[PDB]
Amino acid sequence: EKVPRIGQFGFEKASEFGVPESKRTELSFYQLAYDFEDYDLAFRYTWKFLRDAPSSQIKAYHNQALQADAKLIHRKVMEAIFDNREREADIEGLPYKVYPLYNGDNMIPPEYNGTTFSTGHNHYLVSGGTKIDSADVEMAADHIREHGYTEENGTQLIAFAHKAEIQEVRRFRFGQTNNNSAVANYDFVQSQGESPLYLPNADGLLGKQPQSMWKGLRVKGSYDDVLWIEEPTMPAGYVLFL
Amino acid sequence: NQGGYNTAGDIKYKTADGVSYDSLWNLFSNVTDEWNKHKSKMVQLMTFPVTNQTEKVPRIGQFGFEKASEFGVPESKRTELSFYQLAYDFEDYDLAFRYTWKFLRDAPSSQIKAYHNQALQADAKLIHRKVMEAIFDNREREADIEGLPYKVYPLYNGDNMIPPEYNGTTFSTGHNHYLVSGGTKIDSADVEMAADHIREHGYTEENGTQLIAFAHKAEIQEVRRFRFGQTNNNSAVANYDFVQSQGESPLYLPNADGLLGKQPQSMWKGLRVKGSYDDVLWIEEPTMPAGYVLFLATGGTLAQQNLVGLREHEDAAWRGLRQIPGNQTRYPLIDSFYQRSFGTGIRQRGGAVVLQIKASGTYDIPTKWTNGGGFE
Amino acid sequence: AKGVKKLPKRKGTNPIPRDKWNSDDIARRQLEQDQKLHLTTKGPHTGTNDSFK
């Protein structure tokens, strides 16, 4: 991980008889680990089946094994993000701890621009309301941006969400009330490829228009500076900010 | 700070989980802090190299005619010369590294290079502090030059020195440029007072000078709200508009459709300008303490050289940061020294103003720039 | 010429205003230097783990 910076020196006012006081510093560092596991499938047949069955069925079973692999790797990546529990792993016979996002545990995030975090820092957030609102979206994006990761540092934030939450977010308009009595501080700007929309006011939309696609995925629009992506794999009640 | 001799046992491994202690120290072997680059920029735009260890400002009196007569002869007229002397201070500064013989046997080479590099950072920090407290410390100093005791000055500070007369304006004793606002937040009234305290001494836009204000962002967040004829903080009414710099977002412009004149520049000497109130460019200064603003005249006829003189030594063998071989050697103990010598004073005592935002009482020197203690 | 400049006005979509500052640019430039303070390692494959969290 990022090596913490050394201490800095300072001079002393000189004398014609004496000698100055001595200076020193020290270093520190750390590392993180990753899990590993084995998975396997079987294909058992009888001698009559391989005599009589069409070759197309065997080739279909092989093509389906390659698709069973794609489903496995996808699940295991997504539960690395969405399962908020720390895992033990053994590597070369020694134990290690492997991590989710910050989960209310005893890691302290490093200080950034003079803001210092506590133990108990968390990134698995509950909205406190039956429908998403702009205060939830602004809270969540700021929980990322307090660690660095800001638009001035050249990042893009992305939100991956289900249709049931995107259809709330695209109704956010500046100074208007949303769900849960929140008031939006920005407005949702459609991507250039969406269905046409009348601009509501001569006082035009508070946001830049997103391009059609990010990373080969189609973008719905943007609220704050985060891009919103309709993600069919996403479960209903959840948003991933990245 | 950690202090003392470097010992075996301050060394803690050759390697840990396969990484080497020499590679860790090699990261820091040649770093430079962006704050120490900024501090070096501020010194470079706020100082000049002293060639003349003292300065004189002479003046003479004046006389007029009287009515003639067909018989008499006039009363005689006479005048006398007078002057003030200014001087620049000088001081010596020192630092050590000390080692045990067995520390030097076992320690990674990169740790010594990292210590050397941090001594260059400490030198840049020292020069910056000593330049800023020349402006902010508000008190007069002595300086012996050729064993004659000269006198070293801050800005005008309520002393018996009288500013030169300008445009028929005659100043008293007790002229002061360490101003207190008389209110918890900055007024347009305070800004207008502070800029006019400079411009009465020359340092006008007529003379081609540009005033700058360096401030902590919390004061700029008030000054950017000032609009002509509108009330602001302590019941003051603004006599001018704060006009955004050319590079700022249009979303911050007020409810107006035209500008009479032009917007101020985006960049000044590589610093970023927020805008101007009056003709003063407002610059957010990363180093400024919170409750303070520095107003500075620059360019034109009268401010053609920077505010603070740096007096380095007369002999090139004693200029710059130097390493001295130390006087413990080989065994059992080893040491070496870094030595820097210079000092600071102001010639243009009217070329800047310091304004402190506080409710009542006398000016306070910022703790970080009080001359009586600290070297960073 | 006329002494008046017409101010720009809000277009149909207009970017979120964010204040530029000199202190934020120092912090931005420092962080892209701090991003060099990493070493490659032999990973967990060392028969010791005491540098791991």
Q: Chain A to chain B, count of Cβ pairs less than 8 Å apart?
A: 103
C-contacting residues in A 156-185 (Cβ below 8 Å): none
Are C5 and B259 a contacting pair at CB < 8 A?
yes
Q: Closest residue of C to A198, CA-based?
A: C12
Contact B285, B216 (CB under 8 A): yes
Are A32 and C53 a contacting pair at CB < 8 A?
yes
Tell me which residue in A23, A26, A29 faces B95 most closely, judged by beta carbons: A23
Resolution of this PDB entry, in A?
2.7
Contact B188, B365 (CB under 8 A): no
Element (H, E) at B22: helix B21-27
Tell me which residue in B23, B251, B272 faces C17 most closely, judged by beta carbons: B251
In whole angstroms, give the CA distance from residue B59 to residue A145.
Answer: 62
CA angle A122, A110, A149 (to 5 degrees): 75
Tell me which residue in B2, B12, B338 faces A7 most closely, judged by beta carbons: B2
Are B24 and A24 a contacting pair at CB < 8 A?
no
B372 lies within 8 A of chain A by CB: no
Return the residue in C7, C9, C14, C22 with the most chain B beta carbons within 10 A, the one to mutate for interface testing. C22
Burial of B340 (0-12, 13-18, 19+ CB in 10 A): buried
Contact A218, A230 (CB under 8 A): yes
Q: Distance from first CA to last CA of chain B, Å, rounded?
A: 12
Are B93 and A13 a contacting pair at CB < 8 A?
yes
Give the three-class secondary structure for B56. strand
Q: Which two tokens stand for residue B150?
A: 């000269």
Could you say which DSSP state residue B299 is in? B
Collect all residues of chain C within an 8 Å Cβ-Cβ radius of residue B263: 5
In whole angstroms, give the CA distance from residue B232 to residue B223.
Answer: 9
Contact B160, B107 (CB under 8 A): no
Give the three-class secondary structure for B18. coil
Q: Which two tokens stand for residue B145?
A: 């030059």
B3 lies within 8 A of chain A by CB: yes
Q: Distance from first CA to last CA of chain A, Å, rounded?
A: 20
In whole angstroms, give the CA distance from residue B297 to residue B213.
Answer: 9
Collect all residues of chain C within an 8 Å Cβ-Cβ radius of residue B285: 22
The amino acid at A140 = A
One-character DSSP codes across B192-248 = HHHHHHHHTTS--TTTT-EEEEEE-HHHHHHHTT--TT-B-SSS-B-SS--EE-TTS
- For residues A39-51, b (16+ Cβ closer than 10 Å) or e, as one string? eeeeeeeeeeeee
Sequence length of chain C is 53
Q: Which two tokens stand for residue B245?
A: 């710099």
Give the three-class secondary structure for B350. coil
Are A7 and B27 a contacting pair at CB < 8 A?
no
Q: What are phi and psi of B271, to 5 degrees?
A: -80, 155
Contact B217, B293 (CB under 8 A): no
Are C5 and B271 a contacting pair at CB < 8 A?
no
C8 lies within 8 A of chain A by CB: no
Contact A66, A13 (CB under 8 A): no
Q: Closest residue of A to C38, CA-based?
A: A2
Collect all residues of chain A within an 8 Å Cβ-Cβ radius of residue B375: 10-13
3-state DSSP of chain A = CCCCCCCCCCCEECCCCCCCCECCCCCCCCECCCCCCCCCCCCCCCHHHHHHCCHHHHHHHHHHHHHHHHHHHHHHHHHHHHCCCCEEEEECCEEEEECCCCECCCCCCCCECCECCCCCCECCCCCCCCCCCHHHHHHHHHHHHCCCCCHHHCCCCEEEECHHHHHHHCCCCCCCECHHHCECCCCCEECCCCCCCCCCCCCCEECCCCCCEECCEECCEEECCEEEEECCCCCCCCEEEC
Beta strands B333-346; B91-100: pairing state:
antiparallel
Are C16 and A96 a contacting pair at CB < 8 A?
no
Collect all residues of chain B within an 8 Å Cβ-Cβ radius of residue C3: 260-261
B299 lies within 8 A of chain C by CB: no
Beta strands B178-180; B352-356: pairing state:
parallel
Burial of A22 (0-12, 13-18, 19+ CB in 10 A): middle
Are B118 and A25 a contacting pair at CB < 8 A?
yes
Question: Quick one: which of A241, A2, A230, A1 has its CA closest to A123?
Answer: A241
One-character DSSP codes across B69-111 = -SS--PPP----EEEEEEE---EEEEEEEEEEHHHHHHS-HHH
Task: Name the minimum distance, in Å, from the CA of C33 to any CA of chain A.
Answer: 11
Q: Distance from first CA to last CA of chain C, Å, rounded?
A: 69
C6 lies within 8 A of chain B by CB: yes
C47 lies within 8 A of chain B by CB: no
Question: Quick one: which of B371, B297, B291, B314 has its CA closest to B131?
Answer: B371
Contact B109, B21 (CB under 8 A): no
Contact A107, C53 (CB under 8 A): yes
Task: Name the minimum distance, in Å, from the CA of B104 to any CA of chain A.
Answer: 14
Question: Quick one: which of A5, A56, A50 has its CA closest to A28?
Answer: A5
Question: Quick one: which of B109, A196, A195, A201 has its CA closest to A187?
Answer: A201
Give the three-class secondary structure for C28. helix
B270 lies within 8 A of chain C by CB: no
C33 lies within 8 A of chain A by CB: no
Beta strands A205-206; C13-14: pairing state:
parallel
Q: How far is Cα of residue C12 from the mean position of the Cα atoms in its chain?
A: 28
- What was the experiment behind these coordinates? cryo-EM
Are C41 and A224 a contacting pair at CB < 8 A?
no
Collect all residues of chain A within an 8 Å Cβ-Cβ radius of residue B371: none
Element (H, E) at B188: helix B188-199
B258 lies within 8 A of chain C by CB: yes
Q: Which two tokens stand for residue C39?
A: 């070493």
Contact B357, B138 (CB under 8 A): no
In whole angstroms, give the CA distance from residue B25 to residue A3.
Answer: 10
Tell me which residue in C12, C15, C44 faces A33 most closely, judged by beta carbons: C44
Contact A150, A115 (CB under 8 A): no
Q: Which two tokens stand for residue B283?
A: 């610059």
Neighbouring subunits of A (3+ Cβ pairs under 8 A): B, C
Residue C42 vs residues A33, B19, B254, B374, C45: alpha-carbon distances, Å:
12, 7, 59, 44, 6
Contact B178, B363 (CB under 8 A): yes
Name the residue with tokens 């973008």.
Answer: A219
Residue B319 vs residues A19, B37, B94, B297: alpha-carbon distances, Å:
20, 21, 14, 29
Question: Taking the CA of residue C49 as centre, how many other CA atoms within 13 Å lie in the half-sphere pointing to its CB?
Answer: 15
A-contacting residues in B 80-139 (Cβ below 8 Å): 91-98, 114-115, 118-119, 121-123, 125-126
Are C13 and A189 a contacting pair at CB < 8 A?
yes
Tell me which residue in B16, B249, B260 faces C17 most closely, judged by beta carbons: B249
E strands, chain B, are 15-16, 19-20, 47-49, 54-60, 81-87, 91-100, 141-145, 148-152, 178-180, 210-215, 243-244, 258-260, 267-268, 271-277, 280-284, 292-298, 308-312, 322-324, 333-346, 352-356
Question: Quick one: which of B291, B277, B27, B248 has its CA closest to A5?
Answer: B27
